[PDB]
Amino acid sequence: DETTALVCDNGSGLVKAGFAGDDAPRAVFPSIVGRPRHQGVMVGMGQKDSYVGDEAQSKRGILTLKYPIEHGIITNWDDMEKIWHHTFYNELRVAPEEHPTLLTEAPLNPKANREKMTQIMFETFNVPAMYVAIQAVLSLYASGRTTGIVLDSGDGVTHNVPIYEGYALPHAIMRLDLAGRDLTDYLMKILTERGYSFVTTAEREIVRDIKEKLCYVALDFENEMATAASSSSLEKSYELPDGQVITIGNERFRCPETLFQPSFIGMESAGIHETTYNSIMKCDIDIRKDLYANNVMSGGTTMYPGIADRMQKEITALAPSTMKIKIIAPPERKYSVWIGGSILASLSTFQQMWITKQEYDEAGPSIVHRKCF
Amino acid sequence: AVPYVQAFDSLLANPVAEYLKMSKEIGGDVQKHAEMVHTGLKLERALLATASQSQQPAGNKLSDLLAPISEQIQEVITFREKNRGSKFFNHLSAVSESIQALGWVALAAKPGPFVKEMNDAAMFYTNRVLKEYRDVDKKHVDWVRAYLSIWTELQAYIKEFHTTGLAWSKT
Amino acid sequence: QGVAFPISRDAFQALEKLSKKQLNYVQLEIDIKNETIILANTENTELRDLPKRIPKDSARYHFFLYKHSHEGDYLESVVFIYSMPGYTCSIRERMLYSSCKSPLLEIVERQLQMDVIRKIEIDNGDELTADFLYDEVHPK
Ligand SMILES: Nc1ncnc2c1ncn2[C@@H]1O[C@H](COP(=O)(O)OP(=O)(O)O)[C@@H](O)[C@H]1O
Ligand SMILES: [Mg+2]
Ligand SMILES: [Mg+2]
C-alpha cells in the first residue's frame, strides 16, 4: 500500500476501491451526496452543507439525496469530485499524487466525459499516472473469453454489452434504468403491503440484506406463486440485528421477478431477457451465434440464485430452436469489474501502459482514446 | 432545581452513566469518545439550569448561550473524523452522526422529532456494530443498547417538559 | 490493445515451423508468475486427435493446421484456439489468457504472416469435431 496502484470502480450506486493485487476491493461505499432538506432552524450545531456515501445514507431522513451518475453516466461533476476525494482521503486513506490510478468506465461513455475524468484526476487529484478500462470488457475477460454479451446489472443501471475480441459494439448496447436499489425499494414496498414496517435508513439496510440473502429468481414464476399460496415450503426465516426472527414467503422471488417483468414497479420497459435478445439482434448476423453461446453476467444484481437458469430459459424461448445458448455466471461476478482491474494493474507488464502526467501534458486530452484496453 | 433540571440529572445518572460504564469496558477510542459525549451532556445540563431561571434571550446573548454545546458537538465529530483508521470506526460513526441531537435546545419547534432522526442516524451504525460483535463480546451489544437509551430517554424527557421547544422561564 | 507478454524463443521457432507447415500443431501456455508466453507442446496432430490436445484442468492457446476440402480446394489453414475449461481456472488465469490473446495474435501475423483463418474460443476438446471446425471456418 506504499506506492501500490489504485483500482477505482465508480459504480452507478457503489464505489469499489482498493489496491492492485488484492483479491477484493478494500472500500465499498454508496456513490451518493446528501444535502440538508431545509436551510436551517439552528446555526452550526455540527451541521455540514453536504454529506457523502454512508454519512449521507445514515442521515437520509433529514437530507435530499443525489447520485452523481444518471442513466449510467457521470453527470454531476462537482458531486463526483466529492466522491473521488472521499475515496482517496477518507476510505483508502492515501495521497493520490503517490499512486497510479486505474478507473473503470460505464458503457456508451462520451469521449468528452472520459477526457473530463482524466482532467480531474491529473489536475485536481494530481495522480502520477492513469488508466481507463471499460467495466464490461474487464468482466468478460475475467470470465475467460474475449467475445460475448455481458449482462451488467448493478445498483442504478443494467446494460447488455455485446463485445467482439475485447471491443464493445456501441450501436448494439442496451440500457435499462432498473437495477439493485430499485429491487431493494420494491422489496420494502411488498414487505410493507404484507404488514411489516421498514422505513428508517437502518431498516432500508435490513431490507437490502434480506434481498441479498433470501431472494431468488423462480424458473416458472406462476408455478412458484401457486406453491407459495398452498404451501409454506418457500418460507425463509430472517434474523433482525436485535435478534427478532421474521418469516418471508413469495417476496423472495417476486422482488427479482421485476428484472424480467418491469411492470411490477409500473416501469414501461422490456425485461432483461428481451433487452439481451434485442442487443444480440442489433449486431451483424454472423457474430450472433457467438453472443448466444456467451451470455456473461456481472454485477451485484446478477447474484440471485436461479437468475442464470431463468436467463437460459428466456433466451432459448426467443432465439432460433437450433441455437446453442449458454449463460456464464462467474462466482466472482459481484466484483468481477474491480477484480479484473486489480489483476491488470498488478502486472509488471502493465507499468508501461499507464498514461503518465508527462504524457498527458505533451499529447493533450486525445491520449485517453489512443491508450486503450 | 425545577422538575426538568432534576429530570435531566436523572438522565445523566442513569442511561448516560451506563453508556460511560460500557465505553470504559471497550476502552480505547470508544472510551475517549464517551468522555467528549459526557462533556456535551454536562454542557446541556448547564444550559437547562440557565433556561430554568431566565427568560428566552435573543441574538448575541442566545448565541453565547448555545455556543459551548455547538462547539462540543464539533469536538465529538472531529474526533471520529481524525480517527478513520480506528479499530472501532462504526462505534465512533454511530456517535459522530448522532451527537447533533444535543442541538435540540436551539430549535424553535419540534425538538422531539429531531432527536428521533438523530437516533435513526446512530442506528445505521449501531446495527453494523451488532452484526459484527453479536458473536464476539456481549459488551458491544450492551454498549449499543446503552448509547441508544440516551436518545430514547432524551425524547421522553423532551415530550414531558419541552414538547414545543426548550421551556425557558416566564418570570 | 491488451497486455503483451513476451513469447519465448522456443514458442516463436515452433510457430515459425507451423507457418512453413513443418509442424501441424503448436500449444502455448502462459507462465503467470513470469508474465511470459512459453511453448507447451508441438505434438503431431491430425484432426481426429485434436480433442486429445485440449487440457481439461487449465486454459491454453493453440495454433492448429486444419487440412480440409472446401469448394474443390484443399486448404491447409491455421486455426487459433483459446481453450478455457471453466472454473478449474483461477480468475487470474482467465484474466491473463483473455488479456494476452490480442497482442499474441498481432505479433504472430506481423512477424510470421501466419494468416490465421479463424480464432475460436472453446470450453472443451470434445466440441472440436470435423463438422464444428468446418462450420466455424466456413459458416453458411
Ligand atoms: N448477493 C446479492 N444478491 C442480490 N443483489 C445483490 C447481492 N450483492 C449485492 N447486491 C446488490 O447489487 C447492487 C450493487 O451492485 P454493483 O455491481 O456493485 O453496482 P454498481 O456498479 O452499478 O454500483 C446493490 O443494489 C446490492 O444490493
Ligand atoms: Mg458497476
Ligand atoms: Mg465457445
Numbering used by the authors:
A (entry chain A): 3 to 375
B (entry chain C): 39 to 209
C (entry chain B): 176 to 315
Study text:
Another actin-binding protein implicated in filament disassembly is cyclase-associated protein (CAP). It is conserved in evolution from protozoan parasites through yeasts and plants to animals, and is thus among the small number (<10) of core actin-binding proteins present in all eukaryotes. CAP is a relatively large multidomain protein, which can self-assemble into oligomers, most likely hexamers. Here, we reveal that CAP promotes rapid actin filament disassembly by accelerating pointed end depolymerization of cofilin-decorated actin filaments.
By determining the crystal structure of CAP’s HFD domain in complex with actin and an ADF-H domain, combined with atomistic molecular dynamics simulations, we uncover the molecular mechanism by which CAP depolymerizes actin filaments and recycles actin monomers for the next round of filament assembly. The ADF-H domain of twinfilin is structurally similar to ADF/cofilins, and interacts with actin through the same interface, but allows crystal formation due to its monomer sequestering function. The 1.95 Å resolution crystal structure of the tripartite complex revealed that the HFD domain binds to the pointed end of an actin monomer, between subdomains 2 (SD2) and 4 (SD4). In comparison to other proteins associating with the pointed end of actin, including tropomodulin, which prevents elongation of actin filaments and β-thymosin, which sequesters actin monomers, HFD domain binding heavily relies on contacts with SD2 of actin. Intriguingly, within this interface we observed a tailor-made hydrophobic cavity in the contacting α-helix of the HFD domain that coordinates Met47 of actin and thus locks the D-loop to an upright orientation. Moreover, interaction of the HFD domain with actin is spatially coordinated by specific aromatic residues and ion pairs formed between the HFD domain and the α-helix of actin (residues 55–61) adjacent to the D-loop. Accordingly, mutating Phe162 and Tyr163 in the HFD domain disrupted the interaction with twinfilin/actin monomer and cofilin/actin monomer complexes, demonstrating that these interactions are indeed critical for binding of the HFD domain to actin. Interestingly, the HFD domain interacts with the cofilin/actin complex with higher affinity compared to bare actin, although it does not make a direct contact with the ADF-H domain. Analysis of various actin structures revealed that actin is more twisted in the ADF-H domain/G-actin and in ADF-H domain/G-actin/HFD domain complexes compared to structure ADP-G-actin. This provides a plausible explanation for the binding-preference of HFD domain for cofilin/G-actin.
